[PDB]
Structures are given as C-alpha cells and as structure tokens.
Design a protein around this ligand. Structure first.
Ligand code: CLM
Ligand code: CLM
Ligand code: CLM
Ligand code: CLM
Ligand code: CLM
Ligand code: CLM
Ligand code: CLM
Ligand code: CLM
Ligand code: CLM
Ligand code: CLM
Ligand code: CLM
Ligand code: CLM
Lengths: 209, 209, 209
C-alpha cells in the first residue's frame, strides 16, 4: 500500500522517519509517491539497532524527490582488495566458510546539509558529504563529496555550476538562515523567496543583535 | 496489482491513457510489466484538471519501454536562483510561511515525435522535445532536445549517432509516413520493414497524387 | 508480497531461479529486498520455453545487489536500421500489419563470470560478457564487454581501474579458485579473505597434485 496519498504532496521527514540512525532537520520532507515506501527505506542497509554503524544525517529545509536513496552499511561486507569479493563471513549456513574473516568496513556518516534539493532517483554512495545549498539532479549517482551550493548531475555525478557567486555563497554560509528562529524566517520570507541574497544578509545583520 | 499480464506484450497508449493532459498518437504503446503501473503514472507530476500546465504529447508508432518516465510540472515549485530551493509556498500548514511567493515555473510541453523508441527506465526532463525517429537508450537521462533520427544514451544523455544518412533523414522528414492512410501503410509494410528508405520514398511519390 | 524477509540477507540463485534459460553457479546470490521480486524477474524478457534464445549464464561466488537487471531478448523486435523502429510484426491484432517482417535479432548469451560483484540497479545490456572478478558499480549501464577484474561504473559504464596488478590477475586466472573442491576452499579461506594473492597461488600449487 502506498505510503503517500498524492504525487503532489510529500511528508515531513520528522513525521515519517522511525530508524534511530537517521537524524533529520526541521521542515525537510520526502515526496515518495512514485516509489511507495516512506523515507526509512530510502536509507538502504541502515541497521536500526546499534551505535557502531554509519548514520544518515539530513539538515533542515531539504526537499527529497521520489525514490532517492542513500546507500548505507559501508562496503556491505565486500572487500574488492581481497582475493574474492564474495562475503563468505556472511554465509555461515555453509560450514566450509567457518574460517572466513569479516570484510565489513565503515565509510563514515552520510551527511546532507541544509537547503539541499535532492532529485528523484538520485543515489548517494556511502560516506558522502553534501554541502549546504546543493542541488542534486534527478538520477545522479553521487560518488564524491559535494561542495556547498553546487548543482550536480550525471552518473557519475559531476558539478555543473554553482547556484550563486562565491561572494553570495560566502554571505549565505555566514548567516546560516536555516538555523534562525522561526519568527525571523517568517519575517524574511519575501527575501528568502527572492534572488536578493545581499538583502537577506542585510536583514540578518539588522536582527542578529 | 500489475496492470500488465506479460513482459512480452504492452498496451496501446490510446487504450490506457486517462490523463487529459497526455495526448497520444495511433499505435504507440507502453510495455510496463517490470514497473506495474499503466502509462499515466509515467507522466510524473502531471496535473489532470486544468489547461494551464505543461502537457505531454506523444506521436504515432512510438515504442515505450518499462518504467520510462516523463517529468512534468516544470520546476515543481523550486527556484534554485532564490535564496532557498525549499518550496515554502507549498507548505502552508506552517503559518510562518504565509508570506511565501510561488516559485513555480512552467518548462513548456514535453513533445515526443513519431516513430520514437524509448528505452526502459529512460527519464525525460521537463520541457524536452524529441524529434521524429529518435532512439532513446535505456536509462538515458534526457536533459536537452533530441534531433530527429538521433540515437542517444547516457546520464546525461549524449548523441551517439544518427539512424540514417542526412539524405535519408531528409526523405523521411519529407514523406511523413506516420501520417499516411492505413491502406498505404499496409501496402508499404515490406518497405517499412526494410532499410530501403529510397524505395519507401519512391512509393510515397507514386501514391501521393 | 516481498520475496525477501530482510535487506540484510539475500538468497542463493540456485534456490530461487526457476527460468530454465538462466544457469547459475554455486553460492552466487541475489539480495533483492528493495525491489521485491526474486531473481527470475531480473532477467528481463527472457523466454523460458525454448532453446533458440539468448541465455543468461552466471558463474559461482557472485554477489548481485537489489534491482540489478539483465536485459534479454536481443533487440526485442526493433530494428533501428529499418525505416521504422516500430514492431509491426508483433502487433498482429492490426490486420494492416499482416505483411510485416520480424525484426527480431539475437545478441548472444549474457555471460557473467565467477567472483563478480554486481551493484544494485546496474543494468546489463543484451549480449554482454563480464569477465571473472569484475566489480560492476551500482547503477552502471553496461554497454560493452567487461575485462576480468575490471572495476567499472557509470552510464554508460567505463572502466575505472582493475582490482589487482596484471601479474596478480594472471595468477588468479590460472588457479581458478572458484572451481576448487569445497574442502580446498575451506582450507584456503584465510587466504581468500586477504590480499595475499601470491600466497593463495602458492597454496594452489601445493595441493594441485
Ligand atoms: O511535497 C511538496 N512538493 C513536492 C515537490 O518537491 C511534490 O511532489 C509536488 C510536486 C509538484 C507540484 N506542483 O505541480 O506544483 C507540487 C508538489 C510540497 Cl507540498 Cl512541500
Ligand atoms: O544480525 C544482524 N546483522 C548482522 C550484524 O549483527 C550482520 O549484518 C549480518 C548479516 C547476515 C548474517 N548472516 O548471514 O548470518 C550475519 C550478520 C541483523 Cl540485526 Cl540484520
Ligand atoms: O532534476 C532535475 N530537474 C527537476 C525535474 O523534476 C526540476 O527541473 C528541478 C530542477 C532543479 C530544482 N532545484 O534546483 O531546486 C528543482 C526542480 C535536473 Cl536538475 Cl536533472
Ligand atoms: O528591509 C530591511 N529592514 C526593514 C526596515 O528597514 C524591516 O526591518 C524589514 C526587514 C525584512 C523584511 N523582509 O525580509 O521582508 C522586511 C522589512 C533590511 Cl533587509 Cl534593509
Ligand atoms: O509490446 C510489444 N513489444 C514489447 C517490446 O517493445 C514487449 O515487451 C516485447 C518484448 C520482447 C519480445 N520478444 O522477446 O520478442 C516481444 C515483445 C509488441 Cl507486442 Cl507491440
Ligand atoms: O491543489 C492541487 N494542486 C495545487 C495547484 O492547484 C498545487 O500543486 C499545490 C500542491 C500542494 C499544495 N499544498 O501543500 O497545499 C498546494 C498547491 C491538487 Cl489539484 Cl494536486
Ligand atoms: O536500450 C538499449 N538496448 C535495448 C535493450 O532492451 C535493445 O538492444 C534495443 C536497442 C535499440 C532499439 N531500437 O533502436 O529501436 C531496440 C532495442 C541500448 Cl540502445 Cl542502451
Ligand atoms: O514498387 C513500387 N511500385 C509498385 C509498382 O511498380 C507497386 O505499386 C508497389 C508499391 C509498393 C510496394 N511495397 O511497399 O511493398 C509494392 C508494390 C515503387 Cl516503390 Cl517503385
Ligand atoms: O546477502 C548477503 N549480503 C548482502 C550484501 O551483498 C546483504 O544485502 C547485506 C547487506 C548489508 C550487510 N551488512 O550491513 O553487514 C549484510 C548483508 C550475505 Cl548475507 Cl550472503
Ligand atoms: O508467443 C510468445 N512469444 C512470441 C514467440 O513465440 C513472441 O515473443 C511474440 C510476442 C508477442 C506477439 N503478439 O503480439 O502476438 C507474438 C509473438 C509467448 Cl511464449 Cl511470450
Ligand atoms: O556500487 C558501489 N558501492 C557500493 C554501495 O553499496 C559499496 O561501496 C561497494 C562497492 C564495491 C564493492 N566491491 O568491490 O565488491 C562492494 C561494495 C560503487 Cl563501486 Cl558505485
Ligand atoms: O601455507 C602454506 N602451506 C601450509 C604448510 O606449509 C599448509 O598446507 C596451509 C595451506 C593453506 C593455508 N590457508 O589457506 O590458510 C594454511 C596452511 C602455503 Cl600457502 Cl606456503
């Protein structure tokens, strides 16, 4: 049964996420009608029962399209530098594999910043960091860390351009509007819904003491 | 429940399409067994209830493989040139967002020509025009308009080659066999099932007055 | 209903495969929780009822991730070198198409070697041969044959690197550990779970008469 009533509406990550090893920021949402499942299944292979695994961390004011996925569990027990990539350690039904060593290796957390737009069916590899403000094109295969405000696409994903000038990006990284009190975001809404980064920064300087 | 009985058979677009904002030509079909849904769900985010949206237009004698998708609704309410890509205007459950502006922007219709082969899990971005005779490889991410008779593939999709010489393409674009009366298509079937473009054009000149 | 109980466990190919035109080696498995179906549906368009079609052959000690697919049935009745790519021969419901010729062309078997790791949602095109020891990255679109021990990724897929030196690859191709009696694999398990290719080859020379 589809978790979603409509392709024209998602649901807050904070409302649907049940895996303890996913941490999500305010207002971020997943719109998953075309793939049926809620967001937890987007975090593939993420054990929910222990601290000693790579975690998935998502910032605030993120938009995540249908069927995006975040590949967890590191190398999933496969070490291609070993003679075989086959996970003998994980097939203990076979007594002949009893002397196997565990190939599992962590990749580090997957960290998605604030104000990140993730297109439908993008797939983020293990251990990837995505900076604030990035745009991940639909169907991107994200194999490398993504700089703040980068627009990327492709398989493998490559940076196409940045959303703003370096000077504007510096202003945004300084003001961190995604952490403002809600009443300031409410007041700033006309500027947030605009290309006027300099004006948004001017408001930040006005209210921030 | 799967809309399709078999992976070895599709169904005519004209028989399955119910969205009023999808227009389809004769004999074009969708073979969707491996993704379950009928063709309407291939047109993602396509509002069915109004005239003032981008429409999906598909020509005649097109073949569409399983899970191909056509991304509609323009930018879906996200403007990356604005300070935030987050669609505040669409989260009016939050009163703090009441002053938001609508970021929505149309992309233009998605237009698929005649005699177009679309491979399984190709994904066509908003506003894309695909010329007559094109071949869209499986898993293509189509980010730019496609020339008539181009064979393309990849993510992002790139033109690999064309199906015919420029001279042969000129003959095909002149004769427009996909608009012939059915009795002419019936008579031309041996030539249509052949590489004899010059002969097909000769038949067109014979019957077209 | 999901064929799989868990994303953390697959099932042996030998246990789940029912299509007579799929041949699989020992211990190879498919972990398909995120796409629901058992492995047979991974082999798209593979007729089960006759000898005169391209077959899917998979070696031993292969690991196949969720939603990987192997596109069978050659050109599926579409010949882009003909005037139309539309499969008139397959729409005999329309009497006007009765003079159509069958465009179907075989591509040759799809052959996956031993000790091959196939990432989730990789898609292998018709007729492709993948050498022993290869690693197929997640979401690869595999359009060309893959050399033994190549690590590939992308759409279209490209070779990134090889797993071992040419000298080490030569040792592995000579010893063919994937065909050893199980008692030798059991004894060699510490070396198989290691980067010590030279030591594994030394054990092979010790026991092989
Ligand atoms: O969920 C939301 N938007 C997503 C797009 O990110 C939703 O799927 C959607 C798509 C299209 C659209 N439209 O055509 O205006 C509106 C919402 C907002 Cl309601 Cl928060
Ligand atoms: O036991 C579990 N996971 C273990 C680590 O505790 C690991 O992922 C695993 C998977 C399969 C397996 N096996 O085939 O027996 C053993 C451990 C469950 Cl919590 Cl998924
Ligand atoms: O994913 C893409 N486009 C989507 C289609 O749903 C749409 O055009 C879009 C692109 C960017 C965006 N953003 O920068 O926030 C929002 C929607 C391309 Cl960037 Cl690959
Ligand atoms: O406009 C500004 N301040 C005015 C008073 O000069 C007021 O405080 C204000 C701030 C923000 C705003 N907004 O984000 O829409 C509107 C008015 C600064 Cl951005 Cl210069
Ligand atoms: O639907 C049709 N063909 C699609 C391929 O575009 C169908 O999925 C199919 C696939 C393979 C095939 N074969 O092996 O001959 C026949 C039909 C025709 Cl019946 Cl109109
Ligand atoms: O009301 C609808 N769509 C509106 C435009 O009329 C637009 O897509 C939309 C989506 C979500 C929304 N919201 O969160 O309240 C508001 C409008 C339904 Cl027809 Cl999908
Ligand atoms: O999609 C592709 N191949 C499909 C696999 O189902 C098949 O080989 C095919 C290719 C082209 C085609 N056509 O030009 O009409 C028909 C089938 C490659 Cl072109 Cl990426
Ligand atoms: O073959 C041709 N005309 C013959 C008579 O000369 C006849 O009219 C015809 C036309 C088309 C055809 N076909 O498409 O198979 C067969 C015969 C022209 Cl293509 Cl030169
Ligand atoms: O099926 C198996 N492994 C696959 C990975 O190839 C399974 O999906 C899996 C994934 C992650 C994992 N982990 O976190 O350790 C264990 C098994 C082994 Cl149990 Cl044979
Ligand atoms: O009859 C079958 N397949 C035939 C070859 O025997 C071929 O794939 C096919 C598909 C569709 C079709 N049709 O539309 O009538 C005819 C043959 C079934 Cl076994 Cl799938
Ligand atoms: O598919 C990939 N990574 C997977 C994510 O599940 C994982 O990092 C992995 C990569 C290689 C591998 N191997 O060489 O056997 C095993 C797991 C990249 Cl190689 Cl594209
Ligand atoms: O270690 C070796 N032989 C020892 C005796 O010298 C013994 O036969 C053995 C072989 C393999 C092995 N293993 O794969 O772990 C352990 C001991 C050869 Cl690899 Cl040099």
């Amino acid at each position: 049964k589809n978790y979603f009533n409509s392709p024209f509406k998602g649901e807050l990550l904070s409302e649907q996420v049940k895996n303890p090893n996913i941490r999500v920021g305010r207002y971020s949402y997943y719109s998953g009608y075309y793939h049926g499942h809620s967001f937890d299944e987007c975090a593939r292979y993420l054990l929910p029962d222990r601290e000693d695994v790579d975690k998935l961390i998502i910032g605030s004011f993120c938009s995540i399209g249908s069927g995006a996925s975040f590949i967890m569990a590191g190398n999933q027990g496969h070490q291609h530098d070993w003679a075989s990539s086959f996970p003998f350690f994980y097939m203990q039904e076979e007594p002949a594999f009893s002397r196997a060593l565990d190939a599992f290796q962590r990749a580090g957390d997957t960290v998605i910043g604030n104000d990140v737009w993730i297109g439908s069916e993008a797939m983020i590899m293990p251990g990837i960091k995505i900076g604030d403000g990035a745009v991940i094109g639909s169907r991107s295969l994200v194999t490398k860390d993504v700089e703040p405000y980068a627009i990327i696409g492709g398989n493998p994903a490559k940076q196409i351009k940045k959303r703003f000038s370096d000077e504007e990006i510096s202003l945004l990284m300084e003001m961190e509007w995604w952490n403002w009190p809600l009443d300031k975001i409410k007041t700033a809404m006309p500027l947030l819904c605009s290309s006027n980064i300099f004006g948004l920064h001017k408001y930040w300087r006005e209210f921030a003491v």
